[PDB]
Amino acid sequence: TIALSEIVSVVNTSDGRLEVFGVGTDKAVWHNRQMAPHTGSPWSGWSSLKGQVTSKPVVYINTDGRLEVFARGTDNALWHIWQTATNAGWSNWQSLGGVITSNPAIYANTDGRLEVFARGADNALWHISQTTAHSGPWSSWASLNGVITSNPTVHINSDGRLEVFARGTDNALWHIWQTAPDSNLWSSWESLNGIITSDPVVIDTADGRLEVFARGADNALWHIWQTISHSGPWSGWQSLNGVITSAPAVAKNCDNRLEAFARGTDNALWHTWQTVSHSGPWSSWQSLNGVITSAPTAVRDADGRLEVFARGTDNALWLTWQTASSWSPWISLGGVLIDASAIK
Amino acid sequence: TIALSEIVSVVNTSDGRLEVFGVGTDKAVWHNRQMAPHTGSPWSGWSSLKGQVTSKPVVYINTDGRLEVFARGTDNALWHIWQTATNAGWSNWQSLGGVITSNPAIYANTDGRLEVFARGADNALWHISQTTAHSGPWSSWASLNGVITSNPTVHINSDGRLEVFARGTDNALWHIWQTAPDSNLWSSWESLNGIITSDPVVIDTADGRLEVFARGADNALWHIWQTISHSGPWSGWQSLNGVITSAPAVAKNCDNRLEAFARGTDNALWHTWQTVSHSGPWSSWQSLNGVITSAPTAVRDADGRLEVFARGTDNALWLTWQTASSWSPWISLGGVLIDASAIK
Ligand SMILES: OC[C@H]1O[C@@H](O)[C@H](O)[C@@H](O)[C@@H]1O
Ligand SMILES: OC[C@H]1O[C@@H](O)[C@H](O)[C@@H](O)[C@@H]1O
Ligand SMILES: OC[C@H]1O[C@@H](O)[C@H](O)[C@@H](O)[C@@H]1O
Ligand SMILES: OC[C@H]1O[C@@H](O)[C@H](O)[C@@H](O)[C@@H]1O
Ligand SMILES: OC[C@H]1O[C@@H](O)[C@H](O)[C@@H](O)[C@@H]1O
Ligand SMILES: OC[C@H]1O[C@@H](O)[C@H](O)[C@@H](O)[C@@H]1O
Ligand SMILES: OC[C@H]1O[C@@H](O)[C@H](O)[C@@H](O)[C@@H]1O
Ligand SMILES: OC[C@H]1O[C@@H](O)[C@H](O)[C@@H](O)[C@@H]1O
Ligand SMILES: [Cl-]
Ligand SMILES: [Cl-]
Ligand SMILES: [Cl-]
Ligand SMILES: [Cl-]
Ligand SMILES: [Cl-]
Ligand SMILES: [Cl-]
Ligand SMILES: [Cl-]
Ligand SMILES: [Cl-]
Ligand SMILES: [Cl-]
Ligand SMILES: [Cl-]
Ligand SMILES: [Cl-]
Ligand SMILES: [Cl-]
Ligand SMILES: [Cl-]
Ligand SMILES: [Cl-]
Ligand code: NA
Ligand code: NA
Ligand code: NA
Ligand code: NA
Ligand code: NA
Ligand code: NA
Ligand code: NA
Ligand code: NA
Known part of the structure; x- marks a missing residue:
């Protein structure tokens, strides 16, 4: 076994928007994206990219800016789906075969x-x-x-x-x-x-x-x-x-200070960060509250702020981000997400 | 004619150090580099990569992290020199021919x-x-x-x-x-x-x-x-x-706010920046002082701070950078730099 997994894959798009990929109860891949390239942007809401996955779906950006999502299929083959043009529409799911x-x-x-x-x-x-x-x-x-x-x-x-x-x-x-x-x-x-x-x-x-x-x-x-x-x-x-009590997630602040996030024993989000400068001494562990049912997922947005996603008790995806002074209160992006990790 | 040029080419190396390339009175390419990946790092001092150039030398980082410098030769061909290994030693100057x-x-x-x-x-x-x-x-x-x-x-x-x-x-x-x-x-x-x-x-x-x-x-x-x-x-x-009274230079703050730098009529460095967030309204023009004899050259360092280089009245390269509160006093990196721009 391994510590409880991250339940979403996130990227910062070629046009500076966060886009998050997760799995629903019927094993389709769903995505949610920021409308605008800024902290606290409105979100699309969840839409289905279909498929039938038996792993965490993992998004990666091609060097031409086209997103591509990789997941194990119900046949244990590697499947993928890609944008046909940068931040435009998607292909159908296609098999790359193998058994994974x-x-x-x-x-x-x-x-x-x-x-x-x-x-x-x-x-x-x-x-x-x-x-x-x-x-x-x-x-x-x-x-x-x-x-x-x-x-x-x-x-x-x-x-x-x-x-x-x-x-x-x-x-x-x-x-x-x-x-x-x-x-x-x-x-x-x-x-x-x-x-x-x-x-x-x-x-x-x-x-x-x-x-x-x-x-x-x-x-x-x-x-x-x-x-x-x-x-x-x-x-x-x-x-x-x-x-x-979960896998850790890691991200870089816009001054390159590493920051680590994980669920604590109280099921709140906890974090520790390099202080002062990159490679500087690590802070005490501090709470960002919430009650989470997944590892957190951390990403730097187009304003150079960290945003953290985690599943809540309601199985919705919740979100908190850095502010000038501290972190925002958790807000819900809704949805109903499962942990589809091929290894648990 | 064109406004007075930048006199150096700068990059942030694969190991997070600033490295600057300029031309001496005898037309060789010289470079100066930060020892450490942080604002206010000690510098190597100028060392010669030799050559005989008739353009601004322009450094670019290969996708494997090896620096490569491009310059016009005295034969008006395109010449280049490259690191043989990432942040290690350099090739000899070699000709790519043509007339530029x-x-x-x-x-x-x-x-x-x-x-x-x-x-x-x-x-x-x-x-x-x-x-x-x-x-x-x-x-x-x-x-x-x-x-x-x-x-x-x-x-x-x-x-x-x-x-x-x-x-x-x-x-x-x-x-x-x-x-x-x-x-x-x-x-x-x-x-x-x-x-x-x-x-x-x-x-x-x-x-x-x-x-x-x-x-x-x-x-x-x-x-x-x-x-x-x-x-x-x-x-x-x-x-x-x-x-x-010079070409402008542009760089991105670590929150992606664009910031523009140029010499003013008083021969001081002036700057204007997007305020609040990337794509936000531009500030008033403010002075960073100095007395400069080139366009400024702006780069974001590994601490996510802007550093600006410009030639001084003594033909040395001088440097000022962002601090928590404002900008550092100008310090000299010495050397004797010429404007070798193939177009003036
Ligand atoms: O080039 C567009 C796309 O073409 C497909 O044939 C490939 O499988 C993808 O990996 C690629 O992103
Ligand atoms: O087709 C894409 C191109 O379209 C042109 O209309 C724009 O001026 C270019 O900047 C752009 O790269
Ligand atoms: O330079 C050494 C430093 O490297 C950083 O990447 C680590 O997180 C620090 O704990 C370590 O002291
Ligand atoms: O900005 C420095 C650090 O300060 C803390 O108070 C924040 O909560 C961290 O997320 C941040 O990395
Ligand atoms: O691959 C190492 C180097 O090889 C040389 O032959 C090329 O001219 C360079 O552009 C390249 O960086
Ligand atoms: O040769 C380079 C490699 O050397 C090994 O000793 C290290 O463990 C690797 O992390 C590194 O990529
Ligand atoms: O979104 C529009 C904005 O784009 C920025 O890149 C420009 O510098 C601003 O002046 C402009 O208002
Ligand atoms: O940090 C916001 C801005 O504040 C100004 O006072 C600084 O001098 C600029 O260089 C900076 O981009
Ligand atoms: Cl589903
Ligand atoms: Cl297709
Ligand atoms: Cl499909
Ligand atoms: Cl082996
Ligand atoms: Cl546990
Ligand atoms: Cl960004
Ligand atoms: Cl689940
Ligand atoms: Cl010289
Ligand atoms: Cl050689
Ligand atoms: Cl040589
Ligand atoms: Cl044409
Ligand atoms: Cl002028
Ligand atoms: Cl950097
Ligand atoms: Cl000169
Ligand atoms: Na992972
Ligand atoms: Na981006
Ligand atoms: Na990875
Ligand atoms: Na290309
Ligand atoms: Na230029
Ligand atoms: Na770098
Ligand atoms: Na360019
Ligand atoms: Na490679």
Whole structure:
């Protein structure tokens, strides 16, 4: 098992609007979007992109600005749907085949080719890519091996190499990296040790270091980072303390200060942040209240403010954001969302 | 003629450091870089990358994080030098041939291929590109036609199409765009009218609109913008007032508020900014003092603060940056910089 998952995927569109993707009780993908590129914008309300998903749906922006959503189908194949034009209409759901046993994890190579990673029926990591920038056709599936017990997460290093993180059978954090940008040449799997009890989340620091966050065996928030830009060694695991009852979410403030969010034991949203400057000391854990039934999902909007989404007791999606002084009261975006995570 | 030019090219490196490129009295390219990814970092001091340039040297970051500098040679060919590895050492200067009669203008296509634009001996716009992402070999040269009387500037639209801006023989602002990302298919040249007396500068708004700034016939700062994301019509020319004695520079605050900088009649640095939120009303023009002998160069650092560089009366490069309350006193980074602009 893993800590309670994020229930939505969110992106900041090519025109600076937040757009959020979730799953309804009938297993269709629904989306909600800001009308205007500003904190506290009115929302569309939930509309259906249809489909029948058995994973968290994961949105990623092509290098031409077209959103593309990836999800496991009821046949355990990887399916996707894409905007036919930037912030315009959507394709039908189409199958990329395979058999996957995790949520998909997506990143753009330096050459604009999306690459998708997912656990397979053999519990190894598999991958498939666009063959040219933001375009089909897609490559054949292949495996990067390993034995995976969490959803994987991919990021890009500051030198353009993709790097993937996942829990192993020993509950350690393991990773594998491209040896060159845009490559099908990968390293061996290596262990970053620790004991993690959530999916890992990964982000790039202002200074081009990958930093991974995960819940520990003691239900504290732990993190580990590249000690120098796009390079080993890693820092070794450090505790940010707290007692968390969901996966953590991480985002960057517009001054690049990292900020971590998670559900506490009182089922409120809690957060801790780098103080003063990026890579500065972490704050005490503080409450943003609410009563939430999912991990929080954190994103920086077009005004450079963090906005956090979480499911409420009513299964609606609720929203709170940074203000000059503190954070807004929670407001409901309605809907009825389920946790469709392929790994729980 | 055009308003007094920016004398340096600056970028925020893949590891969050400012790195600035200028020209010395013996026509070599020199660079200065922050040691640390923070406002008020110590600087390297100026070191020579050698070469013999007859244009402003223009740095651009490859999609793999490697800096690449472009400049006209004494043979009027396009030359370049690149990092052999991200924030590591440099190649020798190598020729991409051609005959150019402007500073080069560079952008990355959505597919990671750098594309360089420059005026030719026929006064038309010419272009050359990497044939694969962040890699040689380079394409053949070809022309996009037009008749150009300023340095050109290129940007990317929020749908991935490159768009180039330049003054024409009628002193109007003209532009041309790719009809598809990564394409060799371009529009015809179209006039955005006006009368401009500086090089144009172009930036993308938080909400994915191109916005162009230029000095007008009345020596005020004027701007014009796409009315909707990656689309016409344009707004028509609007004055931001002021009386400026250099080209303007533009940068985005970390909340995406646009801020414009230019030399005033008192030879001090002046600025005007969007107030409250991105796309909000523009402020009064305010002084940041100094006595400057170049256009200012503005960049957002890894702490999300604007830093502005300008040549002083001593021909040293000086620097002032945003603080919580206002702006820092000017400090000198030394050196002896010339305006090597291929168009003056
Ligand atoms: O280029 C438009 C779209 O074409 C489809 O064939 C691909 O499967 C998508 O991944 C791509 O975004
Ligand atoms: O070679 C670069 C790679 O080196 C390894 O030692 C690190 O653990 C990776 O995170 C890094 O991407
Ligand atoms: O530079 C080292 C710093 O890196 C940051 O990314 C971490 O969150 C800090 O905890 C750490 O002290
Ligand atoms: O602005 C600095 C920090 O101050 C705290 O009071 C806010 O709640 C954080 O979300 C923010 O990152
Ligand atoms: O790929 C490394 C470098 O190779 C050279 O051949 C190209 O001319 C450069 O533009 C490129 O950055
Ligand atoms: O077709 C898209 C293009 O349309 C033109 O009308 C606009 O002037 C361009 O700025 C835009 O890139
Ligand atoms: O949305 C319209 C606004 O766009 C901004 O990018 C301009 O700088 C403003 O002057 C304009 O009012
Ligand atoms: O922070 C809002 C604005 O306030 C002014 O006082 C600063 O000098 C500007 O540079 C800044 O964009
Ligand atoms: Cl549904
Ligand atoms: Cl379709
Ligand atoms: Cl469909
Ligand atoms: Cl392996
Ligand atoms: Cl728990
Ligand atoms: Cl943004
Ligand atoms: Cl559920
Ligand atoms: Cl020199
Ligand atoms: Cl070389
Ligand atoms: Cl050389
Ligand atoms: Cl034409
Ligand atoms: Cl003047
Ligand atoms: Cl930055
Ligand atoms: Cl000079
Ligand atoms: Na955006
Ligand atoms: Na890559
Ligand atoms: Na990721
Ligand atoms: Na996740
Ligand atoms: Na950077
Ligand atoms: Na392009
Ligand atoms: Na440009
Ligand atoms: Na310029």
